[PDB]
């Protein structure tokens with residue numbers, strides 16, 4: 001059985017690096033992280049631009 | 063990093079109040095709740111009508 | 125077996141009350157109305173604003 | 187010919203009132219506003235909750 | 249309030265049995281599981297075929 | 311001209327058998343049923359699990 | 373209150389004429405037909421090509 | 435950079451001619467119109483039928 | 497077994513004629529072409545307007 | 559690099575068996591078939607019912 | 621009230637840089653640009669490849 | 683007439699570079715490749731992360 005958690009990663013560099021930020025967090029906390037699916041991307045536009053990539057991060061249960 | 067939980071709030075009054083019911087629960091349980099996105103709305107039709115609003119509730123991790 | 129009819133309710137007050145207007149009509153005409161799913165919302169903007177909520181209204185057959 | 191502008195209205199009260207806030211702004215600025223279609227709803231959760239309703243606001247050109 | 253978890257069940261037999269595998273896991277771990285909504289289906293094609301059914305599994309909170 | 315009715319069939323066995331339950335009902339009641347399109351699937355989880363398959367059932371008019 | 377019926381019109385000429393074929397049928401049978409929304413288009417390719425246009429046909433109830 | 439405006443053209447003849455009506459208006463008003471994407475089609479059913487085609491009309495900025 | 501190929505037909509006349517252009521090409525090249533499903537429509541706006549209709553063209557294998 | 563082909567399998571038994579029919583055909587013809595994603599399901603209703611499952615069948619190139 | 625404009629940015633380098641190109645243009649022309657949502661990405665393939673990222677760029681009105 | 687093939691490119695570097703990997707393969711094999719549309723993005727998470735970008739790659743026929 002796989003389970004997915006819905007995480008939004010952030011980066012001041014790129015959409016790829018924002019996906020990684022979410023995956024990094026998942027791997028800190030979860031065992032058996034196996035894949036991620038991009039579901040949305042955006043940019044917070046303030047003092048700097050922050051690229052955001054929202055991913056479903058799949059991990060194998062047990 | 064943001065995380066979202068997928069909650070369905072309920073109200074005998076309105077779709078807005080059903081969204082609030084979900085957010086109320088999130089805030090009871092989670093720190094740093096920052097936004098909600100409506101993903102569905104419905105009505106359970108029994109003795110009374112119960113309005114339901116399903117929301118992705120985003121919170122900041124750490 | 126459930127069947128759904130696709131109804132647009134209207135209200136000069138709110139989206140919730142427009143959903144109810146559709147459900148009211150369904151219940152006038154159909155037995156065993158059990159739930160409704162919101163599929164669209166809009167506003168007709170004339171002399172007054174009329175809120176519209178389109179719902180699939182599910183009823184149990186037999 | 188109709189044209190649509192993509193506006194997000196806000197309210198501390200309800201999704202219906204947030205739709206109205208967008209329509210109010212459209213009518214301040216545009217002639218012949220004829221309808222609105224809801225495309226998204228959300229809630230900004232800070233000191234207070236701010237309900238947001240995003241609408242395509244249609245107006246007749248000329 | 250209902251909450252949903254996003255689970256992918258697996259079976260070497262059928263899409264129905266893969267949905268059950270996810271629900272089985274939910275029920276092992278959660279109280280008050282009330283429904284599931286299919287969101288995706290697939291097949292891993294290796295030595296054998298493994299049918300997968302992804303479901304939002306809804307449970308009542310408290 | 312074809313017309314579609316939106317029916318949810320149920321089965322304690324499988325998604326295929328729930329689709330059939332809807333089609334069975336359509337054929338009881340309608341002439342010239344020609345096809346069905348699956349639009350949703352779910353499971354009601356109570357004492358037993360009830361698989362549901364929602365189909366648009368197309369029939370030829372006249 | 374508006375109600376919609378889901379009809380597929382056909383024509384050996386065009387997608388527009390297939391939409392009309394569905395609307396023609398609706399008007400034969402229903403009072404107060406007010407609008408149609410295209411939801412799908414296709415072509416049956418046999419001895420001849422038959423253009424099909426599927427429309428939600430809205431009519432005002434009462 | 436391209437920008438899109440969301441226009442609904444109308445015709446008493448066809449969906450193609452309603453798309454053209456929107457493009458005609460865009461070209462009256464905008465420089466460097468380069469393409470259009472159909473996003474919706476409908477029919478207003480009154481004294482006569484008016485075919486509507488909604489298009490995103492893309493133009494190159496500067 | 498059916499297979500679909502994803503083709504964009506073009507016409508200086510209409511969306512219907514652009515669908516035909518794709519089907520014409522399919523039939524030149526493939527045996528047992530049975531149906532087409534419209535998936536997109538657009539217009540290239542240059543010296544002349546070129547209507548485009550993108551279709552999944554289904555053919556029976558063997 | 560993966561490539562997908564869009565195939566509709568058929569079965570007089572089940573949606574699972576119709577998915578298999580498509581995969582069977584893919585494997586007859588293609589090397590390195592690795593997965594399938596369900597994209598649609600339907601039923602042809604004639605003398606008998608024929609369950610159809612449409613799948614994107616992914617294979618690794620080279 | 622927020623308003624969104626639908627812009628396609630371009631870059632010979634990356635999807636992130638194409639999003640920036642659109643945001644750059646928005647900021648040249650508009651006050652109070654606050655966020656962007658990616659809605660599409662593509663590549664024009666000619667002499668060189670040009671990455672395109674289409675964004676809804678949100679700005680606060682007044 | 684344009685035709686599209688559905689390819690998933692891969693890169694250990696970025697989503698942009700994974701799109702390129704798919705386009706590279708298309709150009710190896712096909713004449714008159716003209717554009718690509720991103721349809722999905724993901725990450726395979728193993729020993730290393732492999733970014734994947736799925737594109738419809740359009741080419742002109744003849």
Ligand SMILES: Cc1cc2nc3c(=O)[nH]c(=O)nc-3n(CCCCNC(=O)O)c2cc1C
Nearest residue numbers: 042043044045046047052230654655656657
């Ligand atoms: C993709 C996306 C979508 C967003 N949508 C909304 C929104 O819908 N309402 C709102 O008030 N704020 C935002 N916002 C938040 C705007 C904050 C940008 N400002 C600073 O970062 O300082 C938002 C942000 C992003 C990245």
Ligand SMILES: Cc1cc2nc3c(=O)[nH]c(=O)nc-3n(CCCCNC(=O)O)c2cc1C
Nearest residue numbers: 104105106107108109114158159160161354
């Ligand atoms: C939005 C939505 C969708 C629903 N869908 C289903 C459904 O698909 N199957 C089913 O058996 N029950 C329901 N139901 C549950 C019907 C219960 C209504 N009856 C009472 O509340 O007493 C359902 C409910 C709601 C609100």
Ligand SMILES: Cc1cc2nc3c(=O)[nH]c(=O)nc-3n(CCCCNC(=O)O)c2cc1C
Nearest residue numbers: 166167168169170171176220221222223478
């Ligand atoms: C959600 C929605 C969508 C609509 N779409 C269209 C439309 O697409 N074309 C059109 O001519 N009229 C309308 N209209 C109808 C415009 C009528 C508003 N005027 C008055 O109520 O007097 C429409 C209305 C609504 C509520």
Ligand SMILES: Cc1cc2nc3c(=O)[nH]c(=O)nc-3n(CCCCNC(=O)O)c2cc1C
Nearest residue numbers: 044096097098099228229230231232233238
């Ligand atoms: C619907 C929606 C969506 C949003 N999405 C994002 C987002 O995706 N990223 C982000 O940084 N901020 C937001 N935000 C902004 C969060 C700000 C909430 N805080 C305060 O209002 O003080 C956002 C807001 C809303 C309403």
Ligand SMILES: Cc1cc2nc3c(=O)[nH]c(=O)nc-3n(CCCCNC(=O)O)c2cc1C
Nearest residue numbers: 290291292293294295300592593594595726
């Ligand atoms: C629905 C679905 C989707 C998939 N998508 C991808 C994918 O997008 N990339 C990838 O590398 N692998 C897979 N895969 C994994 C391919 C593994 C199949 N091989 C074996 O089971 O041994 C995948 C699998 C399934 C079931």
Ligand SMILES: Cc1cc2nc3c(=O)[nH]c(=O)nc-3n(CCCCNC(=O)O)c2cc1C
Nearest residue numbers: 106282283284285352353354355356357362
């Ligand atoms: C697909 C689907 C979706 C559903 N959605 C809702 C829902 O959204 N609200 C709700 O109150 N009940 C349901 N329900 C109904 C829950 C009832 C399960 N319990 C028993 O069957 O005894 C529901 C059911 C199904 C099958």
Ligand SMILES: Cc1cc2nc3c(=O)[nH]c(=O)nc-3n(CCCCNC(=O)O)c2cc1C
Nearest residue numbers: 414415416417418419424530531532533602
């Ligand atoms: C849009 C659309 C979609 C279709 N889909 C299917 C399908 O999914 N399965 C199937 O067996 N037949 C069809 N078919 C039916 C194929 C019949 C074409 N042959 C003749 O008209 O003689 C179909 C038709 C159309 C118009």
Ligand SMILES: Cc1cc2nc3c(=O)[nH]c(=O)nc-3n(CCCCNC(=O)O)c2cc1C
Nearest residue numbers: 168406407408409476477478479480481486
């Ligand atoms: C595609 C589309 C959608 C529409 N939707 C709505 C609607 O949702 N509500 C409503 O009141 N009117 C309309 N209407 C407007 C109905 C007006 C038809 N009557 C006359 O043209 O005289 C509408 C129209 C069209 C073309």
Ligand SMILES: Cc1cc2nc3c(=O)[nH]c(=O)nc-3n(CCCCNC(=O)O)c2cc1C
Nearest residue numbers: 468469470471538539540541542543548664
């Ligand atoms: C539906 C659709 C979508 C399109 N999208 C893009 C696009 O996204 N980028 C781009 O550079 N060109 C185009 N283009 C191409 C613009 C070319 C129009 N000019 C001439 O035909 O001479 C495009 C075209 C069409 C028909």
Ligand SMILES: Cc1cc2nc3c(=O)[nH]c(=O)nc-3n(CCCCNC(=O)O)c2cc1C
Nearest residue numbers: 344345346347416600601602603604605610
């Ligand atoms: C999912 C799906 C969708 C379909 N859609 C259409 C359609 O849209 N038009 C049409 O003429 N025929 C069909 N058809 C074909 C109807 C043929 C059923 N009759 C027999 O099998 O003998 C169709 C079939 C299926 C399975």
Ligand SMILES: Cc1cc2nc3c(=O)[nH]c(=O)nc-3n(CCCCNC(=O)O)c2cc1C
Nearest residue numbers: 540662663664665666667672716717718719
């Ligand atoms: C995402 C996207 C989509 C596109 N769609 C179309 C299209 O649908 N029709 C068409 O004629 N041209 C294009 N085109 C335009 C093809 C032009 C590529 N050639 C050169 O850049 O020189 C197009 C382009 C892009 C980027």
Ligand SMILES: Cc1cc2nc3c(=O)[nH]c(=O)nc-3n(CCCCNC(=O)O)c2cc1C
Nearest residue numbers: 034035036037292724725726727728729734
């Ligand atoms: C986007 C996407 C989606 C995927 N979906 C599935 C899936 O649905 N089932 C499954 O078994 N495997 C996968 N997989 C495959 C998991 C393999 C990751 N492991 C290694 O790369 O070693 C998958 C992969 C990717 C990239």
Ligand SMILES: [Cl-]
Nearest residue numbers: 192242440626
């Ligand atoms: Cl828009």
Ligand SMILES: [Cl-]
Nearest residue numbers: 006068254304
């Ligand atoms: Cl989710």
Ligand SMILES: [Cl-]
Nearest residue numbers: 130316366378
């Ligand atoms: Cl419907």
Ligand SMILES: [Cl-]
Nearest residue numbers: 502564688738
């Ligand atoms: Cl495809």
